[PDB]
Amino acid sequence: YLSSVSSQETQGGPLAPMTGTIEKVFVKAGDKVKAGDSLMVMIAMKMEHTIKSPKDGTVKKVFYREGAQANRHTPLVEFEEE
Amino acid sequence: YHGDSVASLGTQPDLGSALYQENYKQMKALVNQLHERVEHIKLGGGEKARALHISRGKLLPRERIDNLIDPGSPFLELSQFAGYQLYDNEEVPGGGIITGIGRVSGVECMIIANDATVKGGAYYPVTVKKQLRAQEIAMQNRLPCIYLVDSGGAYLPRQADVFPDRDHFGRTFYNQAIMSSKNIAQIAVVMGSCTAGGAYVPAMADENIIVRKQGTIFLAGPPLVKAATGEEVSAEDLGGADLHCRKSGVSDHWALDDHHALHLTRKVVRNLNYQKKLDVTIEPSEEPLFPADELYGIVGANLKRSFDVREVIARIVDGSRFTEFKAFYGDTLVTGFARIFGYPVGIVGNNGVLFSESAKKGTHFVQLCCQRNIPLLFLQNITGFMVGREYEAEGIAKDGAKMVAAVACAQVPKITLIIGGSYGAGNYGMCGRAYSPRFLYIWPNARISVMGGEQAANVLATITKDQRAREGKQFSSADEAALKEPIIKKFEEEGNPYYSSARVWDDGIIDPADTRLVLGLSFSAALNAPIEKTDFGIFRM
Amino acid sequence: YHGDSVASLGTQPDLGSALYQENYKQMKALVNQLHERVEHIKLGGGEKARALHISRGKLLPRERIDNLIDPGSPFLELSQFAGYQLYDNEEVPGGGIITGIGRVSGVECMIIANDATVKGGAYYPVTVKKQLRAQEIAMQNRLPCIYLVDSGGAYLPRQADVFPDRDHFGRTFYNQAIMSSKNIAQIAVVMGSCTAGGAYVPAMADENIIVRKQGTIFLAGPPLVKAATGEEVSAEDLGGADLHCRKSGVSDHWALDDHHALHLTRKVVRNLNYQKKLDVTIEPSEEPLFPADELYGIVGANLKRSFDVREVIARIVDGSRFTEFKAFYGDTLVTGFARIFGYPVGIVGNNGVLFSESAKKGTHFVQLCCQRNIPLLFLQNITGFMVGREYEAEGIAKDGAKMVAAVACAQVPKITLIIGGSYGAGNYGMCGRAYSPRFLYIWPNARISVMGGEQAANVLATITKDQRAREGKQFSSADEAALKEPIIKKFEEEGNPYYSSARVWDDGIIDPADTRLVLGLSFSAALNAPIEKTDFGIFRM
Amino acid sequence: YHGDSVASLGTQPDLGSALYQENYKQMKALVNQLHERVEHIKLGGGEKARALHISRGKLLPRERIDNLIDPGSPFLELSQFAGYQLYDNEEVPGGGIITGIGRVSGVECMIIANDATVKGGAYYPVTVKKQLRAQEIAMQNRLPCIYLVDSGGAYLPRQADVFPDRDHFGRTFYNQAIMSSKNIAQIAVVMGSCTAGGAYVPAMADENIIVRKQGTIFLAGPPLVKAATGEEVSAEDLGGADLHCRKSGVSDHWALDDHHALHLTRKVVRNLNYQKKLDVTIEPSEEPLFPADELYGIVGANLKRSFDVREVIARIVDGSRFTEFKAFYGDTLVTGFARIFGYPVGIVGNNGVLFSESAKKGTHFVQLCCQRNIPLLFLQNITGFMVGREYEAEGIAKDGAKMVAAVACAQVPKITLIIGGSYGAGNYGMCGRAYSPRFLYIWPNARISVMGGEQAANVLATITKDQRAREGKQFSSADEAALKEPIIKKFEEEGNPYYSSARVWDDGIIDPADTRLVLGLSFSAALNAPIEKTDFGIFRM
Amino acid sequence: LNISYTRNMTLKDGKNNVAIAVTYNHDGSYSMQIEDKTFQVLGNLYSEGDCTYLKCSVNGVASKAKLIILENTIYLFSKEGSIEIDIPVPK
Numbered sequence A: 001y002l003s004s005v006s007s008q009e010t011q012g013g014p015l016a017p018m019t020g021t022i023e024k025v026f027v028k029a030g031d032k033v034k035a036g037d038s039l040m041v042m043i044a045m046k047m048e049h050t051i052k053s054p055k056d057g058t059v060k061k062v063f064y065r066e067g068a069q070a071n072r073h074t075p076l077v078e079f080e081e082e
Numbered sequence B, C, D: 001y002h003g004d005s006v007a008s009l010g011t012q013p014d015l016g017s018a019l020y021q022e023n024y025k026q027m028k029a030l031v032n033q034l035h036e037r038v039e040h041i042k043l044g045g046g047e048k049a050r051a052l053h054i055s056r057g058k059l060l061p062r063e064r065i066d067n068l069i070d071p072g073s074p075f076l077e078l079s080q081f082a083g084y085q086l087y088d089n090e091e092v093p094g095g096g097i098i099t100g101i102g103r104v105s106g107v108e109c110m111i112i113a114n115d116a117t118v119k120g121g122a123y124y125p126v127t128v129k130k131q132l133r134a135q136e137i138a139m140q141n142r143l144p145c146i147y148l149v150d151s152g153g154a155y156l157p158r159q160a161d162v163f164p165d166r167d168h169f170g171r172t173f174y175n176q177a178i179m180s181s182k183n184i185a186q187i188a189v190v191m192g193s194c195t196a197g198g199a200y201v202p203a204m205a206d207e208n209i210i211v212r213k214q215g216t217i218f219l220a221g222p223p224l225v226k227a228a229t230g231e232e233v234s235a236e237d238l239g240g241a242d243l244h245c246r247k248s249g250v251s252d253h254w255a256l257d258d259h260h261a262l263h264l265t266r267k268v269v270r271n272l273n274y275q276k277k278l279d280v281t282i283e284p285s286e287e288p289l290f291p292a293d294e295l296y297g298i299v300g301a302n303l304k305r306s307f308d309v310r311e312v313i314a315r316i317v318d319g320s321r322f323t324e325f326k327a328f329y330g331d332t333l334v335t336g337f338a339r340i341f342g343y344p345v346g347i348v349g350n351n352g353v354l355f356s357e358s359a360k361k362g363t364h365f366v367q368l369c370c371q372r373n374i375p376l377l378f379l380q381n382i383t384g385f386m387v388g389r390e391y392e393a394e395g396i397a398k399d400g401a402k403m404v405a406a407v408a409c410a411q412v413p414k415i416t417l418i419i420g421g422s423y424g425a426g427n428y429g430m431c432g433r434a435y436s437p438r439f440l441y442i443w444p445n446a447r448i449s450v451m452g453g454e455q456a457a458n459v460l461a462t463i464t465k466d467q468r469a470r471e472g473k474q475f476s477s478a479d480e481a482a483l484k485e486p487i488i489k490k491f492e493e494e495g496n497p498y499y500s501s502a503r504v505w506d507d508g509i510i511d512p513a514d515t516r517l518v519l520g521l522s523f524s525a526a527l528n529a530p531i532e533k534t535d536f537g538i539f540r541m
Numbered sequence E: 001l002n003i004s005y006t007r008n009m010t011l012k013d014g015k016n017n018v019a020i021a022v023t024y025n026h027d028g029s030y031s032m033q034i035e036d037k038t039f040q041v042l043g044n045l046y047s048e049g050d051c052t053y054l055k056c057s058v059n060g061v062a063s064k065a066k067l068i069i070l071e072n073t074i075y076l077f078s079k080e081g082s083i084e085i086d087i088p089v090p091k
């Protein structure tokens, strides 16, 4: 729990903060990312939110593309099991 | 046993990131702007007025405070920007009065000094409000009041806003009488002329000190005496230290000069037979694990961008240690326990739009703190309440009201810090000015109004688009900005921190790097009064 | 000035004496019997149940307590023998629940943990009584309650003795609500399944912690959901940490495993903002001047032989220092002032049959202790009241009632230790269970009943000797033991310490060598609550 | 101004309807069964015992009460069915004790009289519980206690269930001492023999009365005196009025016969210097607008059928006037304000399965009544909580707990009436016995248990159908009723009102036509004590 | 808050009154201006034996001296010399 490996375990995947349009996607289908790497930018009720990488795991897949409307708490990125 | 290792908040920001570079640059400019404006206010009336003031043998108002407080002790000044551009053609630096909390003879006291270099010390409407705010702070925290009296009376051209009403000049004496009845010492130091209502201040004080020649105390001034009775008498003869000290008896102590009077004041406070007692548990202080100046890059000046409030918390609490309460429920609100300079504190901060879950989570947290007698700190960065047909059907208003009602009834000391927007009913739920927080501070990037400037513009752009679509004369897009641009300008101007602070809506605009120090001083002062039991109303389940 | 030399109690026993050798041997066997029985109870349900419990990733109930309390701190377990042979064919080690007082984050707390290895954590009638006793102790001493919840619900075959009455399972939630209203923290840690009434425990707690996958909370279990609505849902989906933590909001903290939950619990207690304050004067502690294990030889196991209670006192009080009150008046009762671990205590102990003088002497002493707010310790070794025509004519009942009435109204903390017999009204006068002593302990040689076994036998041997002498059919001596032997067997069996302790009549059976330590821990816990003023009734002079 | 016209509850039932005819017939049979059983209990021990009792010049226990209370005043007897078939081969009518509330010299008092015709007045385990319940009622309502003492001591064959524990015989003297310290008068009238613990009752009383020859007080009886000291002494010489009145001094008043003693008791109560004061507003009484006996047809004896609880309310409240609170929200629960005999009352009654909305509605209502100090009346007819995956996800347990916690902390007088089923946690939320309602009554058609008999049968029919389906040996439908029939029989037998009332779980079984009168008497008695302020715990929002 | 405190302090060397303006810097250093010259001074008090010693740096030059303050006189004893400075007494 102190090791912070737990911080990765607390949530399996990053979800959409609110229902909003996806304005930017910074990750390809297979991309190596480190914690704090921005994955997507979403505007909700004219308010910009940037999604950030939870773990250093490589990205297995992306559930949304640019211009898509993503509902609140819907998975945005799939990460390869390690 | 306190040897358990625990997790700590905060993360290292990306200093190389363009966003951090831009945010730091913008926030730094605001802080520099704030600093230089205070420097100008520091000078009061000006060189000619200051030279005249010293030529009479009197100390400058800020030098008086420096000599009054303990050597090297910090001084927490309040409402430095009162009266900033408040009046069209008159400059009133600091409102003509200097108020703050400092340590005298080891006791925290409220110091209220007239600035005689500003309009001769006349009382403007903002001057009365600033003094009344200081008295309210002193009473709520049981802080002895020291009045360095050097005043020229009320400003006649604006008498209707000074004399008559409940919160007008008359309330000043009412507050003195009430505090005296509660054993909150009232000490007046007449270091200049006081006329009409001014003469009441030394008379209403528990102990009183007057300077040998500068001080004068007359209910009716020489000008009124001549008009009423046709007699010519000097101010010293009509008032003066000798007359009051030896004949009238209004004076309790007689002082040779300003330095002597300040020395006497320190002796008076030392004889109050008061000792501070703490109701809360105390733990050794620890510095935060992250630099405070990083708040510049993290927060910036763009309210549209969002940041994690936990980052702000990580840089002000002891050791960056924070126990979050209901972390995964109502995540738009952050609540938890921490310690600042050893004091226990419950922190409530906005992290997004308020929801029904967030309001319920806040209401639960506030009850916990009140039960354990833990001071509460609010970090307002609001953007409104959730808007939707379903949310109203589920009683979002009912949930939001639950929090307004718990916050109002809480009797633990409450301090509010506006680090972002403050709009609509979100202000009330987060302990706005109307809910009597012990102190209220704002960062230089804050905005406050009934609603955001854009929302008012868009709302009107619906009403008049409707007005002409339903009426039938077409209303074009260029007609839209002849509607929207004046509204946005008004809300931007009236929501500015200086506009809010010029009037006394907050207790000051503070540099983010100074947030931890200001909170530490404020909570320390608020602990001078015992914490009472909290009685709640009906919780509308 | 505390430099005065004083006399000390106690004398060196004759180790060579045959009586001492026999008494030591008998008492040692009882202590060894007590130790090995506890070892068996320590294992709970058994190897198969324990192996299954660990296979699910859960800690054993006693390992949870070890990790919860401060490192190396003593743990005062209560009612270890609850349910010992209570039910005909079912073995319920410790009643299926572990209760005791330990230090968490430097604060004394009451810990109530279900033993899931015993009948899957089901609530037997004794289980409810043991928990209710623990809650009563926590409330009377203002000890925060920590519930390590892992339960399987009520035991249906015995529902009538669990559900309905005032002191049945429903009272558990009533106690939680009352303690919360008094600011006695209620903390629940869901480390397993809780169903039906069990789900209320986390809901009724001030702060709540649930494990990631093991914990489950639901008013209606999956079996009831399927029967009522014909839906199949797993326990995790119906309950679970994630549902309650993130959606239901029933969970205040989310824990990965048992170790994480225990770490979180320690943090929660540290934020209670509580500091212990003592109402009594304190003096440095000193060990008794005589070994405690000598109590084996002095006391023995034969209740017919008599010993000087002063010898017991000399081996438990600080420095074996004792100030006797009214030493030569009513000598069958010993009263005096001493100190245990620095705390002041007034000791009342039996030294023979109670007389009118003894009762008066006790009543006078109890008033003294209540006036000075001194805790009271009772050492019950009774053999009855004086029997005689003259004594009744002089109002022995009136005198005995004086003591029952003073003891009942006393508001100072009271602790009772049964070191011998406890029969009839002598039990009431010496602060029996009915008189709400903060704690009640018994030595392994004690006997308790309405009257001594022999007296009941002899009394019946008068009634039926009369029955047949007065009726006229002769009743012979062999007919006498067909009357007396069953009675003596019954009273011996029902007066046994294990019989008394299996039901919750006392808080535990303690080794005499541990008497001083147990008293020190108990009095320390009892001092967490402020001592109130004592209001007495009418003293029937 | 109270002249406003208002709506009234209730509707005229269809007397011709077959359902009404059947329901009336079934309920009438139950009431007739209840009446004739009480008639038998009225006779106590029997003709031979009653003839022997009168032959000694003593009044019968119920004749004593008739002469003690004011002429023509109603007498509220409690727990008439205690001990009904409780013991296998022993008949103990009324438990050997008669308890109730009546008016003596214009003051409401609790009367506790031993029935000497029943087993010679020996104390059975139920006898102790009945007396302890009476003392609890007297203390909670500040009712003076009058003990008509004629007892034969504890029942030795069952001593383990009488003597030792906290709620055993010893608690009786503890209660007397506590009430005396609170200025709740304790009056004892020795109208017969009292031995061993019995002798303490007159000794522990504030004022005491003894009959000339019948009464006897001694710690040790003649049989014990002879065995201990070999002396033969008559009971009168050992005890007796003359010895205690003139020599021992245990007696405060000396009475010639039973009639004289009862006359003296009335004089003693008149000198208590007590006057009743009401904390609540009072309005003139009005009879309900509908006959009470119609409740027979409306309710019936079939718990599976449902009825509108408003119909029950319309026939017991003054003028059938009722102000419903949150009528359309959580409609399965009915809450509102009414008046019974002029007293204000808040009524909570079940009208279906409990839901989240119902629990929230109840919690809101209970806070309202506590704020205004309004007595609360609960009408329990429960069938369980809503069962469903969605309901658990929405925290039905969290909502249900809100009500258990509000009801427990409420300090207004609470009275519970079970007019139907009482199962599971629904019992707790509706102020069950465990939640200390001032009084608890049940109708002859009620059923109470941990769960309904059918649910326990069906649940087991899932567990063992699973047991053999999963194991693989088939378990047939005939194997199902070899499982279900014994369970249903057990729950039917143990949920019967007589089973519940034989043990003291309720204060009596009452005829529905008498509901209004019983409630009026009960609320009137409960108002003898001042209403305290209610302190709530944390409401888990 | 938002400004720096400058203390005006007067000490007397021989018969000459000297006015020193000390600004208390945020870092804990003090900037002192005497006449037209500005000096950056940082220092601490440490005790060796029964004598308090002042370790100080003025404009980066570092020195150690024994400090005794008795009556209205400040005595600094160093190897380079002993200086006695006077504190003016209020009227």
Ligand SMILES: O=CCCCC[C@@H]1SC[C@@H]2NC(=O)N[C@@H]21
Pocket: B220, B224, B227, B228, B229
């Ligand atoms: O009204 C004009 C000025 C001179 C008369 C005013 C009188 S003097 C007595 C009284 N006290 C005042 O302050 N004003 C009036």
Ligand SMILES: O=CCCCC[C@@H]1SC[C@@H]2NC(=O)N[C@@H]21
Pocket: C220, C224, C227, C228, C229, D353, D383, D384, D385, D386, D387, D454, D455, D458
């Ligand atoms: O009665 C047999 C089992 C299925 C029906 C029981 C119902 S479901 C709704 C209500 N809540 C309970 O716990 N039991 C009843």
Ligand SMILES: O=CCCCC[C@@H]1SC[C@@H]2NC(=O)N[C@@H]21
Pocket: C353, C383, C384, C385, C386, C387, C454, C455, C458, D220, D224, D227, D228
């Ligand atoms: O033990 C057998 C009966 C006679 C001896 C009992 C003694 S008499 C003194 C004391 N008081 C009692 O009630 N019992 C014992």
